[PDB]
Write a protein that binds this ligand. Structure first.
Ligand code: CDL
Ligand code: UQ9
Ligand code: PC1
Ligand code: 3PE
Ligand code: 3PE
Ligand code: 3PE
Ligand code: UQ1
Ligand code: SF4
Ligand code: SF4
Ligand code: SF4
Lengths: 173, 28, 385, 317, 155, 91, 156, 96, 79, 67
């Protein structure tokens, strides 16, 4: 089904046309629209005081979670490294004295990271999660590169909200 | 909103249609 | 014939375009657009990545239209696997496919005006855009660059409540399109700078491969969505906005009309979206649900192999084209039996349109060139790929 | 005293000139659904002073440009704008130039040099084009701008802006001569390179040819000039066509009324800017050598005959 | 300052000196603008207003404006310093000549009608419309022809 | 003098600002069509100059003459403009 | 009266003027402008904070390098950067410009803009959220506030 | 109508304690509005939510001086709000 | 006439333009007041009216201009 | 709402009335409470000057029938 967007001399018709042309009516019409909004409530938010709403799936900033007991969740299966589109995550591991399997080095290069959220997806123990925080702008490039200690620390700081967010969205996944 | 019933009428007259029905402020 | 580089950093030129121009007087004698200021390797990089880890590249190819692009790769990978998405996923893709069309047109019409010099339409509709982004975020997690439409359906069902809000918005957006018209559709001045600028004949538009509103604006009736239906765009009913006296003004009117027609398609999708699953049930192609992979061995094995290795698409090649907001977006995906593709030429509605800049802007002033780049909705990501 | 009367009439205008940018960055804002600048200071009142200080501190880049001319153009611009406010006939005008309107017309014309020379001095292709485009539009709009005034004068009787306060003691000159008001308003929009007619610094079309290379202090001076002009021309509309009430006993009423009308018509070109896309160069000139100039010439005759056949010749005092 | 007049005349002379040196066409235009300014000043000094204005709205106006425009088009190539030097050379020589008579504003406004009511510049030139009605007819024919001369010479 | 006083303050205020600016931060076209328009300008400007005297001519006892003369001036120049159009010179 | 005090106060004023008005520059390269344009848009008005998005290297201060700095555009960025006024700050925006992003290993992408222009604030995120840019612009404002140029002059 | 508009403005000004108290809110935020206080976190912070205001501005936090001894009264930072109350502010969760 | 009509609706400036040109070329010719302009302006007393020697046979204003004889502007009054 | 564009305007208005009230009271102070005589044409300058000579040196001082 198609439609013609712009398919298309009595004195009255001609005069009215002249009225428009010489009285600039269609221009006055446009001014009315802007005057109208001037009176509408503007939609801006005080950025520091009020924050634009983000729902639970917002990917934001990477964090590594820990079991309630205190044992870090990651068991170095290293498929988060495998499915990382940008090659961001670098993981090398060795058996901890406990005999368990843990990552000696876990480095997410956030500048390399494109925040796809597949790592959130891929982890079997769900140790690496996309944390809610989006405000982590840094003065130096090195700060953006993150080792296991920063991510684990990021995980501890935001664990309460991360747990609430995963709680809200896990049925969906 | 909070048109006060006079800024709203200037708004309606200038626009030529009822913005009250289709507002820019989303509400519950 | 004065030579001048329109300049990569031009407030008007979308993104970065070096439009070397020879201007007789203010008239533009020759237009040799330069490209590749945003070539990034998207086509070679994909060969080194698995099918699911190349999905995020498609969102970045033309990111104004974030998802509609993802649907083209999806469809393409589904064809090669001869798998088709579940019924609910199809409607979703058409729901977010259209929402995305609006997003692109709000970008194209309002950014067109900002270069022309009208600045209030952009702020009016960017607020509506913003509200739409929020749909993306509450469905995917990202405001733009979602990665929601994956090769076997969408990733996760809609949140419990989104449909209602994609209604409130749709119920009102119309008035917002109406307001802009008032200012421009009939502005005594919009018409002048747009009317009879960059007229493209019908035969010439097909010849230079325009394939988009640019063809539709010249009166050729072709909407790949009606001619070759993809997903469930067949079950909906919409009217293609064909144009006559094709020129910047006419095509514009067409883009405002598809914004209108997309609200008609969105309404339906909300009215008729089926109960069901949002991803194919073949753990072979779609990753297993997390409750299942954490309780069933076959699901873990399928989760591990899918994320680490990949789909393993059967060997073949396909060119699948959808109707992305800009025009025909197609992926020619040659594939060996391997889990990572072999070639993935992205046909960009835009490589063809820019080429036409020369045959459109002839004997035109510097300001005319600015108007014509706008009427082609050039996003340098798709052209440069 | 006279010196004090020079501070007043200057500073006050400069302080008001600063508050126009603010009322521009907020009225354009609310029209576009945004608060505008309110965070620096209370409600953005300190905002104009803030960038002034940034602009002057940032390096005044001297491109590798005819230095003398490059630096003079800004000076001329501001000089002229501030000067054109000297003979304005707010009650008891600073200086009763008997041929004031002519003076206004004269200084207004000289401004063109600034843009022209600036472009030539800048030595950048963008700037050159800007100057050429600017000079043409500017001068052309001067031709109808001048004829529109000559029609007015002939119904006022003299070139002195002070006479119109006595001409408009019963009715605004808008009622009569409204057809020219509109044409004075549109020409006032062109001569201040404001929006509908702002191809001088289109930014999108060509990138600010006038000040492509100008930054910091030079940017500011023209800048200041433009905005002061924005007011002055609006104020001339508020004396020549919208005649504020005046009472010899109470001379203040005029100023107060003059204020209200000047602010509203100054508000109008702010409102015009946000509301309209920008005319093309060719379109702009056509309107004046084609759409208007014939209108302005004819009415001139009508305004020549009007007094005679109505035996309404004005007193020459 | 009675010297006011002489001062002005000197400035005018100096400006014309620059034009004489034939600097860049743009520099020439600028110089003339300065001189024209000096000129209206002098005329006004005698008392003529309308007359002074004219040169301003005509010379300081478009007369040089178009020149300016024009030059942009036909003058592309930028010793001006040397020219400036010769200018100073002329200035001193000019000054020297006045100093010659130095060894060897007294009378302006030579005569005036202290009480007068309809005397002022412009009134006399206003008589182009009455009792001088052949000046302005011939000037109008000059313009009406000049239209045609320029349109073919450009053609 | 009063004007001279005002104007020199006006230049001084500007020159002061430009200086502060520099001293404080120590820490080929083919406009043939235009050419024609430019010439017409020159011409029209001159007419206007011949139309400026009207404000005093309106007072001429010989009012009729002034009317005829003035009317002719505007009309003739109007014709010139129209010709530009007729010959399509400006277009 | 101790000049030292007199100096600090003066510096602060200078810092307040610069921090208050940070006219950013037009630099969208890789679809992050879309986010930036969102900042300029009504939900998160940049202007309120002083930002005005001037579009000429000459009168613009902050350069928000939004997007991928391909090899062909690299020199241009450097040029525009060099042509801005003296006090110029660069805010890298996007993983594509902080480092290399999804296109780090490509042959046509510079691995970061801080290899071509010194960068002051790095805003992270593939489409760094507009609020995040706003956070980044606000951190540039705290960086400027701390700068003490005249006190070092005095103590030098 | 507008007189009630004026009374609302007067109550907002009187709402922030004394003349000095509103001056403090005026300078750091530049917005004066009155809302119920949902909570005060242990790091000095005060949170208010108003149902009447539109979705973007119905929840706001007024930051406090020295929340880790930083002289934060003027250099307000988004990260200052604690992780527990971050989601309430961003509307991630309705519950306080 | 027909073109006139379209002209009234297309290019409706020139039409108005010419119309005025003419209306200004007519009103003066037909006007109960046109004559006054040359009088009202003639009368304005810009220059002093030098007296005349009362030689004899003078019907002119008799000395004091308040005398009845002489021209009058009652036409100007009550005009 | 739009309430806020007013602050700025207030400071513009107040700065556009000052000049008109100022120039029109620094005249009635310097000229002795009587509007500065506007001498458009010489006659007026003559009368003005005549006034100066009539009394003091300043024209504003005005002698009357009692002189
Ligand atoms: C005439 C003056 C009109 C002032 C005005 O804007 O009234 C708006 C009021 C309602 O219109 P609105 O702008 O939609 O107001 C939104 C709410 O209805 C009414 O607004 P709200 O109640 O939602 O807003 C709360 C506000 C309500 O308080 C106010 O109304 C303050 C008004 C300030 C300007 C006076 O409380 C405040 O404290 C606002 C800040 C006041 C700061 C102190 C005054 C600063 C004045 C600066 C300029 C001097 O009625 C009018 O518009 C009157 C003018 C009608 C013209 C036709
Ligand atoms: C759409 O976005 C834009 C705006 O904001 C809404 C603009 O208003 C504008 C207009 C101009 C701007 C870029 C910003 C306006 C500039 C200012 C805040 C003031 C400029 C400063 C000066 C020249 C001098 C200021 C200082 C004084 C007057 C001191 C006097 C004693 C444009 C072009 C724009 O891009
Ligand atoms: C008076 C005319 C303007 C003079 C310059 C401005 C005075 C400094 C100022 O107002 O800064 C506000 C600042 C506060 O501004 P701020 O930088 O904290 O920003 C306020 C907005 N929030 C809180 C959201 C970031 O306080 C000062 O007074 C600092 C003054 C330093 C210099 C003082 C004089 C020496
Ligand atoms: C910089 C250039 C622009 C400077 C500002 C604009 C100046 C415009 C001057 C127009 C001419 C002056 C004028 O029209 O009126 C002057 C006035 C006499 O006019 P009138 O009303 O007849 O008064 C007599 C009866 N009372 O009373 C006077 O005659 C006052 C004395 C003459 C003043 C003329 C203007 C002086 C300008 C001084 C600065 C000149 C700078 C030149 C820079 C270029 C290099 C030299
Ligand atoms: C390019 C532009 C070209 C323009 C060419 C114009 C050529 C003529 C220019 C001068 C015209 C002078 C006309 C004088 C008319 C006049 O004086 O009117 C009086 C008389 C009758 O007119 P009247 O009864 O007043 O009717 C008018 C009603 N509104 O009228 C008469 O009876 C005749 C009056 C003659 C007055 C003396 C004229 C002497 C010559 C003047 C210069 C023209 C020379 C020839 C050309
Ligand atoms: C009988 C005795 C003699 C009197 C006769 C009177 C007859 C009736 C009056 C006839 C003329 C009335 C109008 C006069 C001004 C308009 C003149 C005109 O013709 O407009 C030209 C142009 C529109 O032309 P366009 O649409 O391109 O088509 C041309 C077709 N020939 O116009 C434009 O495009 C203007 C573009 C403007 C862009 C900005 C618009 C701003 C609008 C708001 C402000 C309007 C002015 C406010 C003035 C306030 C007071 C000063
Ligand atoms: C009004 O014209 C415009 C500019 O010039 C001032 C810009 O710099 C820019 C760039 C600014 C941003 C915030 C991308 C845009 C988009 C624009 O439309
Ligand atoms: S996937 Fe989860 S567990 Fe396996 S390595 Fe990455 S993080 Fe550690
Ligand atoms: S987000 Fe995407 S890119 Fe960043 S780490 Fe997790 S997977 Fe690799
Ligand atoms: S970072 Fe993500 S968003 Fe910004 S440019 Fe690179 S890809 Fe596009």
């Amino acid at each position: 089904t198609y439609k013609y967007v712009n398919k298309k001399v009595d004195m009255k018709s001609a005069t009215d046309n002249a009225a428009r042309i010489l009285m600039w009516t269609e221009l006055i019409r446009g001014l009315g629209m802007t005057l109208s909004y001037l009176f509408r409530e503007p939609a801006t938010i005080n950025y520091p005081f009020e924050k634009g709403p983000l729902s639970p799936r917002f990917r934001g900033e990477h964090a590594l979670r820990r079991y309630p007991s205190g044992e870090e969740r990651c068991i170095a299966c290293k498929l988060c490294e495998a499915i990382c589109p940008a090659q961001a995550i670098t993981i090398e591991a060795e058996p901890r004295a406990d005999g368990s399997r843990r990552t000696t080095r876990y480095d997410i290069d956030m500048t390399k990271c494109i925040y796809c959220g597949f790592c959130q997806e891929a982890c079997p123990v769900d140790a690496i999660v996309e944390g809610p925080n989006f405000e982590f702008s840094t003065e130096t490039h090195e700060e953006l590169l993150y080792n296991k200690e920063k991510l684990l620390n990021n995980g501890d700081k935001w664990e309460a909200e991360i747990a609430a967010n995963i709680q809200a969205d896990y049925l969906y996944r | 909103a909070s048109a006060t019933r006079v800024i709203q009428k200037l708004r309606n007259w200038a626009s030529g249609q009822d913005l009250q029905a289709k507002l820019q402020l989303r509400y519950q | 014939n004065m030579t001048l580089n329109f300049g990569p950093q031009h407030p008007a030129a979308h993104g970065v375009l070096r439009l070397v121009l020879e201007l007789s007087g203010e008239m533009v004698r020759k237009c040799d657009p330069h490209i590749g200021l945003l070539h990034r390797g998207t086509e070679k990089l994909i060969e080194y990545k698995t099918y699911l880890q190349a999905l995020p590249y498609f969102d970045r190819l033309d990111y104004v239209s974030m998802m509609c692009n993802e649907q083209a790769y999806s469809i393409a990978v589904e064809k090669l696997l001869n798998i088709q998405p579940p019924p609910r996923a199809q409607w979703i893709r058409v729901l977010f496919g259209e929402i995305t069309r609006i997003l692109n047109h709000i970008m194209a019409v309002t950014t067109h005006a900002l270069d022309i010099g009208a600045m209030t339409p952009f702020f009016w509709m960017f607020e509506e855009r913003e509200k739409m982004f929020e749909f993306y975020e509450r469905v995917s997690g990202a405001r733009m660059h979602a990665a929601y439409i994956r090769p076997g359906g969408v990733h996760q069902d809609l949140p419990l409540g989104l449909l209602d809000d994609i209604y409130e918005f749709s119920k009102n957006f119309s008035l917002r399109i109406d307001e802009v018209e008032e200012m421009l559709t009939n502005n005594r001045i919009w018409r002048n700078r747009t009317v009879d600028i960059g007229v493209v004949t019908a035969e010439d538009a097909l010849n230079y491969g325009f394939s988009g509103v640019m063809l539709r604006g010249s009166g050729i009736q072709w909407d790949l969505r009606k001619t070759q239906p993809y997903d469930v765009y067949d079950q909906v009913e919409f009217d293609v906005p064909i144009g006559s006296r094709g020129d910047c003004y006419d095509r514009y009117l067409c883009r405002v009309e598809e914004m209108r027609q997309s609200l008609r398609i969105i309404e339906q999708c909300l009215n008729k979206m089926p109960p069901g699953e949002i991803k194919v049930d073949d753990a072979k192609v779609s990753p297993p649900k997390r409750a299942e992979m954490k309780t069933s061995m076959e699901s873990l094995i399928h989760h591990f192999k899918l994320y680490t290795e990949g789909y393993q698409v059967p060997p073949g090649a396909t060119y699948t084209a959808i109707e992305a907001p800009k025009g025909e977006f197609g992926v020619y995906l040659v594939s060996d039996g391997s889990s990572r593709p072999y070639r993935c030429k992205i046909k960009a509605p835009g490589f063809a349109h820019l080429a036409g800049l020369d045959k459109m802007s002839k004997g035109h002033m510097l300001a005319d060139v600015v108007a014509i780049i706008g009427t082609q909705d050039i996003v340098f990501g798709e052209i440069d790929r | 005293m006279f010196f004090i009367n020079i501070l007043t009439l200057l500073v006050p205008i400069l302080i008001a000139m600063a508050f126009l940018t603010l009322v521009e960055r907020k009225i354009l804002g609310y029209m576009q659904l945004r608060k505008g600048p309110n965070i620096v200071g209370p409600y953005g009142i300190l905002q104009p002073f803030a960038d002034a200080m940034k602009l002057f501190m940032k390096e005044p880049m001297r491109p590798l440009t005819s230095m003398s001319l490059f630096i003079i153009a800004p000076t001329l611009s501001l000089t002229l704008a501030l000067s054109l406010w000297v003979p304005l006939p707010m009650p008891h005008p600073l200086i009763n130039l008997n041929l004031g309107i002519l003076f206004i017309l004269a200084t207004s014309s000289l401004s063109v040099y600034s843009i022209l020379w600036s472009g030539w001095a800048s030595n950048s292709k963008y700037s050159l084009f800007g100057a050429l485009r600017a000079v043409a539009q500017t001068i052309s709009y001067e031709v109808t701008m001048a004829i529109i005034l000559l029609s007015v004068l002939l119904m006022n009787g003299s070139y002195s802006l002070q006479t119109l306060i006595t001409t408009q003691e019963h009715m605004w000159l808008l009622l009569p001569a409204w057809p020219m008001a509109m044409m004075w308003f549109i020409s006032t929009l062109a001569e201040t390179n404001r929006a509908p007619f702002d191809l001088t610094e289109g930014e999108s079309e060509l990138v600010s040819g006038f000040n492509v290379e100008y930054a910091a202090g030079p940017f500011a001076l023209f800048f200041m000039a433009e905005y002061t002009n924005i007011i002055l021309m609006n104020a001339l509309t508020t004396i020549i066509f919208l005649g504020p009430l005046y009472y010899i006993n109470l001379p203040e009423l005029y100023s107060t009324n003059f204020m209200m009308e000047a602010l509203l018509l100054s508000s109008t070109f702010l409102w015009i800017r946000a509301s309209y896309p920008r005319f093309r160069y060719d379109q702009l000139m056509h309107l004046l050598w084609k759409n208007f100039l014939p209108l302005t010439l004819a009415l001139c005759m009508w305004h020549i005959s009007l007094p005679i056949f109505t035996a309404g010749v004005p007193p020459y005092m | 300052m009675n010297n006011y007049i002489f001062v002005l005349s000197s400035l005018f002379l100096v400006g014309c000196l620059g034009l004489a040196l034939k600097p860049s066409p743009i520099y020439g235009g600028l110089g003339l603008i300065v001189s024209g300014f000096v000129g209206c000043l002098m005329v006004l000094g005698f008392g003529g207003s309308f007359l002074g204005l004219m040169v301003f709205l005509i010379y300081l106006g478009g007369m040089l404006v178009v020149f300016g425009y024009t030059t942009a088009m036909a003058t592309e190539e930028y010793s001006n310093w040397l020219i400036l030097g010769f200018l100073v050379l002329g200035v001193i020589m000019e000054v020297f000549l006045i100093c010659v008579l130095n060894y060897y504003g007294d009378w302006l406004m030579y005569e005036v009608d202290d009480v007068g009511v309809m005397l002022e510049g412009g009134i006399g030139v206003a008589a182009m419309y009455s009792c001088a009605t052949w000046m302005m007819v011939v000037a109008g024919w000059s313009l009406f022809a000049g239209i045609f001369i320029i349109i073919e010479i450009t053609r | 003098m009063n004007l001279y006083t005002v104007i020199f303050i006006n230049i001084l205020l500007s020159l002061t600002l430009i200086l502060v600016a520099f001293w404080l931060p120590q820490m080929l076209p083919f406009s043939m069509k235009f050419f024609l328009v430019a010439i017409t300008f020159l011409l029209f400007d001159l007419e206007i100059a011949l139309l400026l005297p009207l404000p005093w001519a309106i007072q001429t006892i010989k009012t009729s003459t002034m009317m005829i003369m003035a009317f002719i001036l505007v009309t003739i120049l109007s014709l010139g403009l129209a010709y530009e159009w007729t010959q399509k010179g400006l277009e | 009266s101790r000049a030292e005090y007199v100096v600090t106060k003066l510096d602060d004023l200078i810092n307040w003027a610069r921090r208050s008005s940070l006219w950013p520059m037009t630099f969208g390269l890789a679809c992050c402008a879309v986010e930036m344009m969102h900042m300029a848009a009504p939900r998160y008005d940049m202007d309120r904070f002083g930002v005005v998005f001037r579009a000429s290297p000459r009168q613009a201060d902050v350069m928000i390098v939004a997007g991928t700095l391909t090899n062909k555009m690299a020199p241009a960025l450097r040029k525009v950067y060099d042509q801005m006024p003296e006090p110029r700050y660069v805010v890298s925006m996007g993983s594509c410009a902080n480092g290399g992003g999804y296109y780090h290993y490509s042959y046509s992408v510079v691995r970061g803009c801080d290899r071509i222009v010194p960068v002051d604030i790095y805003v992270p995120g593939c489409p760094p959220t507009a609020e995040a840019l706003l956070y980044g612009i606000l951190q540039l404002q705290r960086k400027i506030k701390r700068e003490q140029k005249l006190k070092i002059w005095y103590r030098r | 109508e507008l007189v009630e508009v004026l009374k609302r403005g007067v109550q907002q000004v009187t709402g922030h304690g004394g003349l000095r108290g509103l001056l403090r809110v005026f300078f750091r935020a530049n917005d004066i509005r009155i809302g119920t206080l949902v909570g005060e976190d242990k790091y000095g912070n005060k949170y208010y939510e108003d149902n009447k205001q539109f979705f973007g501005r119905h929840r706001w936090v007024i930051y406090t001086t020295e929340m880790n001894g930083k002289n934060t009264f003027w250099d307000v930072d988004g990260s200052m709000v604690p992780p527990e109350w971050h989601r309430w502010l961003h509307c991630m969760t309705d519950d306080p | 006439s027909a073109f006139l009509k379209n002209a009234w609706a297309k290019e409706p400036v020139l039409v108005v333009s010419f119309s005025v040109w003419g209306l200004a070329i007519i009103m003066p010719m037909i006007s109960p007041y046109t004559k006054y302009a040359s009088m009202i302006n003639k009368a304005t007393p810009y220059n002093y009216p030098v007296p005349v020697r009362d030689d004899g046979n003078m019907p002119d204003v008799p000395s004091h201009p308040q005398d009845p004889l002489g021209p009058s502007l009652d036409w100007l009054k009550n005009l | 709402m739009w309430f806020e564009i007013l602050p700025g305007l207030a400071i513009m208005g107040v700065c556009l009335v000052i000049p008109g009230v100022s120039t029109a009271y620094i005249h009635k102070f310097t000229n002795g409470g009587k509007e500065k005589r506007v001498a458009r044409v010489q006659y007026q300058w003559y009368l003005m000057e005549r006034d100066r000579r009539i009394s003091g040196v300043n024209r504003y001082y005005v002698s009357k029938g009692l002189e």
